[PDB]
Design a protein around this nucleic acid. Structure first.
Ligand SMILES: Nc1ncnc2c1ncn2[C@@H]1O[C@H](COP(=O)(O)OP(=O)(O)OP(=O)(O)O)[C@@H](O)[C@H]1O
Ligand SMILES: Nc1ncnc2c1ncn2[C@@H]1O[C@H](COP(=O)(O)OP(=O)(O)OP(=O)(O)O)[C@@H](O)[C@H]1O
Ligand SMILES: [Mg+2]
Ligand SMILES: [Mg+2]
Ligand SMILES: [Zn+2]
Ligand SMILES: [Zn+2]
Ligand SMILES: [Zn+2]
Lengths: 272, 43, 612, 303
DNA sequence: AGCAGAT
DNA sequence: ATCTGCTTTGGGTGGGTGGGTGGGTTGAGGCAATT
């Protein structure tokens, strides 16, 4: 009566073959072996592979239609259509047995309340700096996330995405024009994310320079930034301690900035 | 209908026999003569 | 039998349930539900609530009824109705609207009132539910919520112009001139294949008269989430809304609003030629409710404060409580806020009633504080810093609308301060063109722009309260004010008062200031009362000069001239004195200028001429 | 089928234009004045309309101006025929080209004036006044008003083809023997054109809520009301609020059809619109414009 | 390939 | 009901007598005004 996908309330994913388990049983694990975007070639299409990189863009979640439910304004029946492509052509005429037998021309109309939607999200994965060859520029690869895997990727994370490498055929005229070149993407299936007190703290702020106790103490005071800012009379005294380093070139200014900016949780490093 | 055309209220009227027909429109959601009039007019 | 599609809940039971809820319901049920029964009174809680709300609506002629969801949970009958509203908002809202209309007509029918029934029959009635559950997040909207009532808190970002949405189509024949209106269903016109007239049954002779159809108001808004909802600090996401009928233009850009609507989703066509649709569905919110987050008694209170003997120092202290020991500056600023009388003259030019004050001195002292306070108090005004890209801009400038790709004339800060105080924080660093437009404003009180094919003049009747800093690290008393200020003599000659607030190092003064500052870690007035008082006086009172005031003004000006050959005072000081006296009269709410007003004005002007 | 309401509204209009006075007749004189100087627009004070007929006639025109406007033009022509028969024809040798004047009715002095931000869709097709500061003005172009075609095969002629918002051609030749239905050629000699200018206005600065971008609108002028608005002026237009369809979708000869994130979906299902939708815009049709902001010749001007 | 038109 | 026929995406394998208020957006080079 209705497609099997309509009543499904679960999503199925494949966890790759772990390296340790493959070595235990004397086998090679292609799925769990990491690859760069460069190594993912055209002969890997249709396989279960893993990619290593940093995510550079994640789109907003949105509903992608799997099964469309229509209704007949005359027959009182409901039709179901399956969509497995970027585009589709909606039904406009009833195909129910009653309509055909009676010949009544009842228009079919869409109903979003009865259809089936799956959360959709599109991401982008870029090569790491250490993976690009000499005198080359990094490349990027699209990723599709469906079901309960959404919101598991954010820009800036270094991840080992495991997915199915598939093409994305064009449709209609664009397919005719495009020739035999094909776009590709990855169907995400599994994601692995990568990882006397004053004097002591000051000396530990940056051990690779020659000690500057006063500067380090002031920088720690900046970092903590303790303040009671509750004037409540219209405005309040500024609640941050600002520090400026000014020195002739040769002293560790940039190193101090880099260290103090890495330590802080919200540190942002910029150049004038 | 007080609401706009795209509000999207759907109906299910029960015939004397156990079959359900589908009508669209708030007026149908409220009334039955309007539902039958729309049924006739939609032919 | 009528049943909602896909469910097993009758419409008739829903209608009767909500009718019973409306005709009989009391706030005491809500109070007991929220565990506040001990606060129940004996008159308001025991009286019918929504019946009173319907009666008042009929009296005022309005139609929209603001409904709170919890009240449905308060009544035993309507728990299922509340859940259905939260799960099938469209049909439930429809039956609610019809029940409201039916009970409205039934009230008049039963109470045999003299009110006209035809007028009631003509009205479309509506309900606007709100507070339908804990507000969710824009990032937490999954496909499970499609066609379900949700609550969103976000910051408005833009709003498109009103869109005409079609309700009823209008068709006319080309051989019989017969017209009939056909309703619309989900954006499809059921246009006829032939006239409904038996005599003229000609087929395919229908035309759409676009201007005789019926249209409804639609508008598309863009919403962005609140700062506190951002988990790490990334770019906030954006969701699109749709508002119909009386909610159109219900919120302006930059407002914080809480919106209740149905999370809907619509297919997108691949191209404007075929019927192919993209598999990805686009979401939006169909809004049903939006919330944003003088009286005789006020007049009597204003008279009571006005009659106070110590009114002047009271207002001066209340202007900027946190500042310490700047009585003269506060008094001058208080006079500036009220503003002198404005004169409309025949056989003569216009004479400005504004007061321009320059707050110049060392950087240590408090000067931006006073400008911020004045901005807060002023009923109209802007805050700006010269050579500041953040500020809107001091002069009207022609630009191109990025959203619509059109040319629009945008008024600058000075024009937007019309009738108010425009505080310019950094007067020292200003472009020469900016200093030219400022001269034109303070002189002619208008800004003229004649570029991009447009020749227009904009009123800029705004006061100015600027601040200045010395060229170096401190003010040198030996040199004159002009050399330190780094402003043209033509420019600093136009301010009615010039205040030299200097941080001379004194043991006592530093002691007092430090004590005040550390302690921060004589009644005063709330800012709202001050602004309402200022607006009332500025809108209603118009003091006039008298013979005694005329004598004192002439005598004071002559005395201030005779002090000097060096020219101690000029005719500018006379205009400053008359304006200050008028402002002082305004502050007392007096309609006349007495000897005391002119005397106060001279004391401030003479002191201002003094250290300056 | 005649429009019974339309005919009666015309009859009341004629009575207004013959018996009104304030004690001499006002509009009777103006028609005479128009006859001497050879003008086209006839100006009517809205306030003058309210007093007569207990105010009933004023409401009918104001509420539904698009519907009743053609009947008003019929009413004026009759009153023009009784007292100034020569005026109807447009103004050494016998001139052959004396067509029929294309009159315009201008109204002013409405009780209220609306802001741009207060324009809604409930007033479409009604008469009202608005105020805004002009920002751009187009160039005067000839607008087709009463097209005249000729059949390509039998050389027949079709005259007075009312034009909608898009180019329109006849669908049925008046020659019984002819079979042409969709083949015509325009005849610009017999066609009547009207002047046409597009003016863009935006709300006044003082009416803008603080820190809000301005609203805008597009006004269309015709006839003698052209070039009466210069950019930067603060004008007060009086016309009829209309809705203009997207003519590209409706199907034009030689044209291929084709803020809101895709939510601006139009209405569909029309015969001309095969699978496309028709979207609409709010516009204006002004009939009156007011801008808020040699010895012998000079002497004659003075009273 | 979907939709717009003539026999 | 069947047969006949045009046009996309967006892009230079349509163009500049269709333009840039129909979108394709960085890079370089010349000119006035600002300095
Ligand atoms: N005390 C120190 N101990 C070790 N290395 C130091 C020390 N002071 C400076 N250096 C070295 O000096 C080199 C230059 O320092 P850095 O780039 O941080 O600052 P800078 O040269 O003064 O800055 P700028 O780029 O603004 O001219 C760095 O390699 C840093 O390692
Ligand atoms: N009554 C007061 N007298 C003097 N200084 C004060 C007083 N109250 C506050 N201050 C100081 O003034 C500061 C606010 O003034 P602000 O910093 O804007 O000075 P300014 O002279 O207007 O300008 P600049 O930014 O160049 O210093 C407060 O942070 C406090 O340090
Ligand atoms: Mg450095
Ligand atoms: Mg300051
Ligand atoms: Zn059917
Ligand atoms: Zn007909
Ligand atoms: Zn013919």
């Amino acid at each position: 009566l209705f497609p099997p996908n309509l009543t499904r309330r679960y999503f199925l994913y494949f966890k790759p073959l772990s390296q340790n388990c493959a070595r235990r049983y004397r086998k090679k694990a292609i799925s769990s072996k990491p690859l760069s975007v460069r190594q993912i070639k055209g002969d890997f299409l249709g396989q279960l592979i893993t990619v290593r990189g940093i995510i550079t863009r994640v789109s907003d979640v949105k509903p992608a239609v799997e099964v469309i439910a229509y209704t007949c304004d005359q027959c009182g029946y409901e039709v179901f259509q399956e969509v497995n492509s970027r585009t589709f052509t909606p039904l406009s005429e009833c195909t129910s047995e009653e309509c055909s037998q009676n010949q009544t021309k009842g228009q079919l109309f869409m109903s979003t309340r009865a259809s089936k939607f799956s959360a959709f999200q599109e991401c982008k994965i870029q090569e790491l700096s250490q993976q690009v060859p000499v005198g080359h520029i990094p490349r990027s690869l699209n990723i599709h996330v469906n079901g309960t895997l959404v919101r598991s990727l954010s820009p800036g994370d270094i991840v080992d995405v495991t997915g199915i490498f598939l093409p994305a055929p064009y449709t209609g005229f664009k397919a005719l024009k495009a020739g035999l070149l094909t776009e590709t993407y990855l169907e995400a299936q599994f994601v692995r994310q990568h990882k006397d007190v004053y004097n002591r703290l000051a000396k530990s702020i940056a051990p690779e320079i020659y000690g500057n106790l006063d500067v380090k103490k002031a920088l720690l005071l900046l970092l903590v930034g303790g303040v009671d800012k509750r004037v409540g009379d219209g405005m309040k005294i500024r609640g941050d301690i600002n520090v400026c380093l000014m020195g002739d070139p040769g002293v560790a200014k940039s190193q101090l900035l880099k260290a103090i900016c890495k330590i802080s949780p919200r540190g942002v490093y910029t150049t004038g | 209908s007080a609401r706009h055309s795209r509000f999207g209220g759907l109906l299910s009227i029960q015939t004397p026999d156990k079959t359900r027909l589908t009508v669209s429109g708030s007026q149908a959601l409220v009334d039955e003569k309007i539902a039958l009039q729309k049924l006739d007019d939609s032919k | 039998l009528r049943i909602i599609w896909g469910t097993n809940v009758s419409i008739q039971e829903c209608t009767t349930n909500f009718r019973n809820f409306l005709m009989s319901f009391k706030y005491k049920f809500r109070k007991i539900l929220d565990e506040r029964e001990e606060f129940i009174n004996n008159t308001t809680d025991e009286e019918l609530y929504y019946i009173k709300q319907l009666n008042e609506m009929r009296e005022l002629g309005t139609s929209n009824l603001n409904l709170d969801a919890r009240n449905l949970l308060a009544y035993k009958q309507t728990e299922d109705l509340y859940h259905q509203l939260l799960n099938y908002p469209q049909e439930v809202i429809s039956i609610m609207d019809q029940t409201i209309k039916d009970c409205m007509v039934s009230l008049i029918v039963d109470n045999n009132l003299d009110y006209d029934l035809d007028e009631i029959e003509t009205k479309f009635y509506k309900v606007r539910p709100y507070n339908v559950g804990s507000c969710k997040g824009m990032r937490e909207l999954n496909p499970n919520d499609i066609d379900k009532l949700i609550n969103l808190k976000g910051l408005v970002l833009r709003s498109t112009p009103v869109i005409p949405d079609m309700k009823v189509a209008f068709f006319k024949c080309n051989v019989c001139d017969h017209t009939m209106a056909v309703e619309i269903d989900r954006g499809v016109i059921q246009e006829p294949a032939r006239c409904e007239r038996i005599d003229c049954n000609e087929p395919n002779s229908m035309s759409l008269i676009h201007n005789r159809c019926s249209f409804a108001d639609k508008q598309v808004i863009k919403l962005q989430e609140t700062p506190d909802f951002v988990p790490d600090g990334q770019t906030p996401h954006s969701i699109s809304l749709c508002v119909y009928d009386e909610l159109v233009d219900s919120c302006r850009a930059g407002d914080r609003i809480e919106v209740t609507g149905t999370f809907r989703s619509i297919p997108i066509r691949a191209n404007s030629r075929q019927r192919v649709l993209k598999s990805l569905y686009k979401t939006y919110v169909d809004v049903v409710h939006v919330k944003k987050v003088i009286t005789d008694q006020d007049l009597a209170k204003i008279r009571e404060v006005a009659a106070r003997e110590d009114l002047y120092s009271l207002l001066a202290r209340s202007i900027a409580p946190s500042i310490y020991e700047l009585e003269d500056v506060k008094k001058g600023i208080l006079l500036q806020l009220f503003g002198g009388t404005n004169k409309t003259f025949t056989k003569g030019g216009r004479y400005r009633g504004d007061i321009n004050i320059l707050l110049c001195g060392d950087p240590s002292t408090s000067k931006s504080q006073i400008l911020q306070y004045v901005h807060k108090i002023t009923p109209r005004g802007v805050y700006t810093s010269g050579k500041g890209s953040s500020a809107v801009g001091l002069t009207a400038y022609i630009t191109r609308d990025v959203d619509t790709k059109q040319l629009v004339l945008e008024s600058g800060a000075l024009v937007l301060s019309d009738g108010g105080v425009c505080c310019i924080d950094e007067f020292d660093k200003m472009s020469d063109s900016t200093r030219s437009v400022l001269h034109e404003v303070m002189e002619q009180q208008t800004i003229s722009i004649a570029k991009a094919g447009i020749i227009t003049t904009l009123n800029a009747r705004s006061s100015i309260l600027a601040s200045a800093n010395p060229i170096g690290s401190r003010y040198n008393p030996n040199l004159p004010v002009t050399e330190n200020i780094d402003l043209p003599p033509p420019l600093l000659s136009r301010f009615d008062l010039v205040y030299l607030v200097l941080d001379k190092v004194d043991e006592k003064n530093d002691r007092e200031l430090a004590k005040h500052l550390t302690n921060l870690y004589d009644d005063v007035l709330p800012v709202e009362f001050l602004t309402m008082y200022i607006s009332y006086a500025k809108e209603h009172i118009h003091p006039i000069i008298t013979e005694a005031a005329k004598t004192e003004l002439v005598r004071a000006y002559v005395g201030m001239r005779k002090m000097g050959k060096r020219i101690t005072a000029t005719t500018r000081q006379l205009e400053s004195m008359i304006r200050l006296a008028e402002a002082h009269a305004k502050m007392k709410l007096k309609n006349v200028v007495e000897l005391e007003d002119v005397q106060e004005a001279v004391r401030l002007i003479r002191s201002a001429i003094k250290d300056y | 089928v005649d429009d019974v309401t339309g005919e009666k509204v015309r009859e009341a209009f004629e009575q207004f234009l013959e018996d009104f006075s304030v004690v001499e007749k006002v509009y009777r004189a103006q028609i005479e004045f128009m006859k001497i100087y050879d003008l086209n627009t006839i100006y009517i004070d809205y306030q003058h309309l309210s007093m007569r007929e207990n105010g009933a006639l004023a409401m009918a025109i104001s509420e539904q101006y698009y519907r009743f406007l053609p009947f008003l033009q019929k009413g004026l022509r009759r009153v023009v025929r009784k007292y100034a028969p020569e005026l109807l024809n447009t103004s050494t040798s016998t001139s052959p080209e004396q067509t029929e004047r294309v009159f315009q009715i201008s109204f002013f002095n409405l009780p209220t004036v609306h802001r741009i931000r207060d324009i809604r869709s409930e007033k479409i097709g009604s008469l009202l006044s608005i105020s805004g500061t002009v920002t751009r003005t187009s160039e005067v172009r000839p607008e087709l008003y009463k097209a005249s075609f000729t059949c390509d095969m039998c050389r027949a002629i079709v005259d007075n083809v009312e034009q909608s918002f898009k180019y329109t051609e006849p669908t049925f030749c008046p020659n019984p023997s002819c079979e042409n239905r969709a083949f015509w050629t325009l005849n610009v000699t017999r066609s009547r054109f009207l002047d046409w200018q597009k003016v863009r206005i935006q709300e006044n600065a003082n009416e803008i809520p603080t820190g809000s971008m301005p609203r805008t609108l597009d006004v269309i002028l015709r006839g003698d009301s052209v070039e009466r608005a210069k950019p930067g002026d603060r004008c007060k237009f009086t016309g009829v609020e209309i809705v203009v369809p997207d003519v590209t979708q409706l199907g034009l000869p030689g044209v291929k059809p084709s803020t809101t994130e895709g939510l601006n979906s139009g209405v569909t299902g029309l015969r001309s619109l095969g699978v496309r939708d028709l979207t609409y815009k709010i516009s204006f049709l002004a009939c009156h414009v007011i801008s808020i902001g040699d010895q012998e010749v000079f002497l004659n001007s003075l009273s």
